[PDB]
C-alpha cells in the first residue's frame with residue numbers, strides 16, 4: 438500500500454507536473470543564460486537554476502535536500518575546465534563523485550574531457566592526478582579513486598578526493614545495492630576530508646556554501662540525482678523527509694529533469710521502502 442502501485446503512480450503524477458512546469462523557456466529568468474554565445478549547457482534542455490548557481494559560467498547548482506548539502510553539476514565542457522577546477526578548490530571539495538563511465542569519457546563524440554585521471558594545465562591552474570585505492574561496490578562495479586591536487590599561483594593549493602564509478606550496474610536490486618554502497622563510500626570519503634580541514638581550523642567549516650560533495654555524471658540529472666537522494670537518506674538529520682520532498686527539492690534547485698528516468702526514481706523508492714521512509718507528503 439504505502440509503496441504499492443497507487444502510491445507510486447501518485448508520486449509520479451506529482452513529480453511529472455513539477456517537471457513539465459520547470460521546463461525552461463527561451464531566456465527563462467529562472468535559469469542561468471549563456472554569455473554572448475559561449476556554450477554553457479552541455480545539453481540544450483538541461484539548464485542550471487540561476488538562484489542556486491555556483492558560478493556564472495558553469496552548469497552547476499547548490500542543492501540542499503533536507504539537511505544534506507551538495508553541489509550537482511554537468512560534466513564540465515572543455516572550455517569550462519579552469520572555472521570548474523576553481524570551483525572545486527574554492528569549495529574545499531571533500532569529495533568529487535564522477536558517475537560517468539570510462540567508456541563514455543573515452544567516446545570523443547561526447548566531448549567529456551578526462552580531467553581527473555590525467556595531469557594538465559588549464560589557464561592559470563595546474564592539476565596533478567594520483568590514483569589511490571580501488572573499492573568494489575558490488576556486482577562487479579568498481580570505484581577508482583584519485584587525489585586531484587589543484588595549484589594556482591597566489592591561491593591555496595587544494596587536494597580533492599575523487600570517486601569514479603567506472604561502469605554502471607543493471608536495473609534492479611543490483612543497482613539499489615550498488616547505490617547504497619556508493620553513497621556510503623562518498624559520505625565516508627567526504628567525512629575523512631572534512632575532518633582534516635576541521636583539525637586544521639579551516640574557516641571553510643563555518644561556511645555552508647563550502648565543503649560540499651560535488652557530484653556529476655554526463656548531464657548531472659540522472660545517476661547524479663539518484664546518488665544525491667541515496668546520500669540524503671544516509672543523513673541522520675533527514676528523518677521523515679519524503680521521496681516527494683527530496684525530488685521536488687532537487688528539481689527546484691537545479692532543474693525539472695533531476696531524476697531523469699523511471700528506473701532512477703524506482704531506486705529511490707526502493708531505498709525509501711527499506712527505511713520505512715514515506716514516498717508522499719500527507
Ligand code: VO4
Nearest residue numbers: 654655658659660
Ligand atoms: O549522464 V546522467 O544526467 O544520464 O545519469
